[PDB]
Short mmCIF file of C-alpha atoms in Angstrom, two decimals:
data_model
loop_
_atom_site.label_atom_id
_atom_site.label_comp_id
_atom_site.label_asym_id
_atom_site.label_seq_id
_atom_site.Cartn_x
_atom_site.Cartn_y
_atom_site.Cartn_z
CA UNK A 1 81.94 120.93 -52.04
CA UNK A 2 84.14 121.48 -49.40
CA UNK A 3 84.12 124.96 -48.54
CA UNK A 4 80.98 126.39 -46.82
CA UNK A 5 78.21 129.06 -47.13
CA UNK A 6 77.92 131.07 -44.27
CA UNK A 7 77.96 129.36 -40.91
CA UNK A 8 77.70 125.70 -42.89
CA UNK A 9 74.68 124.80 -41.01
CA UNK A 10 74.36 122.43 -44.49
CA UNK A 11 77.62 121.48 -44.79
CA UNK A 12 77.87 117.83 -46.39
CA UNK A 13 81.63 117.51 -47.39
CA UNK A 14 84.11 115.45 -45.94
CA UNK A 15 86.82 117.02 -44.29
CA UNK A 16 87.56 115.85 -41.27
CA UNK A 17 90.65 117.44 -39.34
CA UNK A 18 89.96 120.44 -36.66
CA UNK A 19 91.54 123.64 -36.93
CA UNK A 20 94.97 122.36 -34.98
CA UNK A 21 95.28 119.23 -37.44
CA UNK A 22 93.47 116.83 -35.00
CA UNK A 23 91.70 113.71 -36.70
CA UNK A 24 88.07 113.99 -35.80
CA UNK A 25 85.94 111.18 -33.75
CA UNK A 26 83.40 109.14 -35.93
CA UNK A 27 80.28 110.47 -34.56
CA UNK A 28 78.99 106.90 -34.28
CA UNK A 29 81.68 106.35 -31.50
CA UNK A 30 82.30 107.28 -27.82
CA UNK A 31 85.96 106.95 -27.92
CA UNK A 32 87.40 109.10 -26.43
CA UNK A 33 84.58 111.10 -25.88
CA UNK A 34 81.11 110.34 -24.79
CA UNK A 35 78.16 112.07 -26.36
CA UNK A 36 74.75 112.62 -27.04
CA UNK A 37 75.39 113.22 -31.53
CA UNK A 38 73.84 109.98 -32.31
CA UNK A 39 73.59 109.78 -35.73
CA UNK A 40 70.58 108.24 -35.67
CA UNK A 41 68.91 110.87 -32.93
CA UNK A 42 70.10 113.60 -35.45
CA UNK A 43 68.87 112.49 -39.04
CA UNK A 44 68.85 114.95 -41.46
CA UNK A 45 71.82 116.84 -39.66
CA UNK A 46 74.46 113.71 -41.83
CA UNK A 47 76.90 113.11 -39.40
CA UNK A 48 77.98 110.64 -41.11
CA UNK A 49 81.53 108.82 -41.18
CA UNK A 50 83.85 111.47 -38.72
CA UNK A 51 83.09 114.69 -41.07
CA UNK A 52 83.12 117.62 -39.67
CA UNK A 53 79.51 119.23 -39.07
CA UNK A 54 77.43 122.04 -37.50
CA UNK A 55 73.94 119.95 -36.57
CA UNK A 56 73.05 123.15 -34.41
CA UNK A 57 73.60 125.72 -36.72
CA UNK A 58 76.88 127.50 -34.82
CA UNK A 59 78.79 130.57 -35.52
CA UNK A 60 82.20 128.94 -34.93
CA UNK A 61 81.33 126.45 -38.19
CA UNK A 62 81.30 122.58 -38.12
CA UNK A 63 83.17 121.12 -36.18
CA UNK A 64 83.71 117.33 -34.56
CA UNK A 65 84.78 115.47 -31.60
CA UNK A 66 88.46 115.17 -31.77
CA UNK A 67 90.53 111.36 -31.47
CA UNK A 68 92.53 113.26 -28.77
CA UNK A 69 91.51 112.57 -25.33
CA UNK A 70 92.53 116.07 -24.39
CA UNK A 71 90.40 117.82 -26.41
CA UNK A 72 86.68 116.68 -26.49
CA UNK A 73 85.89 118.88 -29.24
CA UNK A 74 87.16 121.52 -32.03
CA UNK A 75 85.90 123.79 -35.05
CA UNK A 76 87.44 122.82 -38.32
CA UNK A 77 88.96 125.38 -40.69
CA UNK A 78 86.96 124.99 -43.33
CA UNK A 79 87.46 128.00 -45.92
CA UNK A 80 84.35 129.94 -47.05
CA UNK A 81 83.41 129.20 -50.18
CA UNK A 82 84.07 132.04 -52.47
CA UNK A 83 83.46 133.04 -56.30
CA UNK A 84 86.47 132.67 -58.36
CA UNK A 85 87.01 132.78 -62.50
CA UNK A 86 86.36 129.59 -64.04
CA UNK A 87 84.20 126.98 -66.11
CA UNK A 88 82.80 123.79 -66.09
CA UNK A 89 82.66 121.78 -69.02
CA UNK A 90 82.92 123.94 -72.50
CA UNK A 91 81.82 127.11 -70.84
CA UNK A 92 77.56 127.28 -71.91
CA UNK A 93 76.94 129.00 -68.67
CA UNK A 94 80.00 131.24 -68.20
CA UNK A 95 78.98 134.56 -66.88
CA UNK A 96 82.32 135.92 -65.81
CA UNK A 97 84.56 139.18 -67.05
CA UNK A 98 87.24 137.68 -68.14
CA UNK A 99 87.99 139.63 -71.55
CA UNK A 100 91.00 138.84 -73.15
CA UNK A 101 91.63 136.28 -75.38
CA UNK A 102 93.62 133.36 -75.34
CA UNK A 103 96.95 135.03 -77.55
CA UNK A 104 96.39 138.09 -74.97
CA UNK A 105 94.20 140.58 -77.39
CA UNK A 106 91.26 142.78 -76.19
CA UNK A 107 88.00 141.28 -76.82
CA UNK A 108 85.74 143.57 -78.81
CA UNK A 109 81.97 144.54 -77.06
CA UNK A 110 79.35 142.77 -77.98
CA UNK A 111 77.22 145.63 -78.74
CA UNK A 112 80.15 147.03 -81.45
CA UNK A 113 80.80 146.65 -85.10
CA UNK A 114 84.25 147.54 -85.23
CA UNK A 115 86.45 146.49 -86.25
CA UNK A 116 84.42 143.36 -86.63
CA UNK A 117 81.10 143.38 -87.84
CA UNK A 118 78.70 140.33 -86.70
CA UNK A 119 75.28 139.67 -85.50
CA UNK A 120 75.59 138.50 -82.08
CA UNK A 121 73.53 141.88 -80.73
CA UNK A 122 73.17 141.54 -77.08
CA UNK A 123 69.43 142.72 -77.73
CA UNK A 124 68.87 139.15 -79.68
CA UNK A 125 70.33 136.98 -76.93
CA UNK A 126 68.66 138.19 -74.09
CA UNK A 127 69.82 135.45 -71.70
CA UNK A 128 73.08 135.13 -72.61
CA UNK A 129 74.33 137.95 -71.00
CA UNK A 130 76.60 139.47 -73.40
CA UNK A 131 77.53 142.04 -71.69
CA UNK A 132 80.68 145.02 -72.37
CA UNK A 133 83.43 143.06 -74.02
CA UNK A 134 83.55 139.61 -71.76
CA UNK A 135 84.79 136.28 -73.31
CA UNK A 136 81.41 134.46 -73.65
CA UNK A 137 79.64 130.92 -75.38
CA UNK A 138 76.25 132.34 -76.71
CA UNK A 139 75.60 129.00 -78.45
CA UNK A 140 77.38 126.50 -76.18
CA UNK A 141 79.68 125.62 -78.52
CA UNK A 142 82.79 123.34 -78.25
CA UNK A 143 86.05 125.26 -77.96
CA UNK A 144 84.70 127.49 -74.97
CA UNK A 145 83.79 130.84 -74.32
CA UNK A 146 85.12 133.26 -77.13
CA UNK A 147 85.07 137.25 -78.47
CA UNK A 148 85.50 138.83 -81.48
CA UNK A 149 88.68 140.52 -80.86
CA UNK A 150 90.30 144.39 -81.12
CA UNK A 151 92.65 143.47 -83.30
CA UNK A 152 91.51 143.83 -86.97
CA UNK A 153 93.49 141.10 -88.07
CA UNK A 154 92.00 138.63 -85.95
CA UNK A 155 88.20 138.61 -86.06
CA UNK A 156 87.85 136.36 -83.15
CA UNK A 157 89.57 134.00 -80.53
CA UNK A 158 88.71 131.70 -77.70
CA UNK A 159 89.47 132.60 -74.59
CA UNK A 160 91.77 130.33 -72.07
CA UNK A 161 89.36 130.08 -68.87
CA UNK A 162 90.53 127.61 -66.26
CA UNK A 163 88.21 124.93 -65.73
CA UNK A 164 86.41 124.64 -62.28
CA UNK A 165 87.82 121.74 -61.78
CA UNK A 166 91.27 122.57 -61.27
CA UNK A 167 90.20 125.37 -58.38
CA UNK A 168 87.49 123.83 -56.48
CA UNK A 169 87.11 122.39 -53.36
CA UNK A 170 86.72 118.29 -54.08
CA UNK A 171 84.70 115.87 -52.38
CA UNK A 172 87.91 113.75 -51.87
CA UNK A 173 88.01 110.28 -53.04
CA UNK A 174 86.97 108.22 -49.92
#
């Protein structure tokens, strides 16, 4: 993806714009800079295409040389990645506490019969992690992760998680 995990010494996205909006160098090239990155000196590190990169492991991030002969070289402002509420596909591995349901109502825990009795006991999905009252899809079912609800009226609802996809940080389509 295109944020990064820690200092990005493994970053193998593809942005590839410093910090001040310059369009980095391909690292195959020596215009306008000169240098000793040759891709094929530094295998394993992917500089590939003009991405930005951190073959040496840097504190300031990746970075590239930049297509302006004024500045040989700049980091990129690459946001850290960071956890945010969401799921992928119909939810199977959602582990977040989100706990409201899609028409706004309380979930119910887990671990209570009231007002709804059931027999999803956290102590028989061990695993699954359901946990206090947090929308969840114990049996990966379509529809998404769901509750049974505090309203006694309603025994239970899905829940309306936004889908990774519309948050993440693309590969972009190169």
């Amino acid at each position: 993806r295109n944020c990064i995990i820690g200092k990005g010494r493994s970053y193998k996205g593809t942005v590839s714009i410093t910090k001040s909006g310059i369009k980095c160098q391909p690292w195959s090239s020596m215009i306008p800079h000169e240098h000793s990155f040759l891709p094929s000196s530094y295998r394993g590190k992917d500089l590939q295409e003009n991405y930005c990169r951190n073959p040496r492991g840097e504190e300031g991030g990746p970075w590239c040389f930049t297509s302006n002969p004024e500045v040989r070289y700049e980091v990129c402002d690459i946001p850290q990645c960071s956890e945010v509420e969401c799921i992928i596909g119909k939810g199977r591995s959602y582990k977040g506490t989100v706990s409201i349901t899609k028409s706004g109502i309380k979930c119910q825990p887990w671990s209570s019969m009231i007002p709804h009795e059931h027999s999803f006991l956290p102590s028989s999905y061990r695993g699954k992690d359901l946990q206090e009252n947090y929308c969840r899809n114990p049996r990966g079912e379509e529809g998404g992760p769901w509750c049974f609800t505090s309203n006694p009226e309603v025994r239970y609802e899905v829940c309306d998680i936004p889908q990774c996809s519309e948050v993440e940080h693309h590969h972009h389509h190169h």
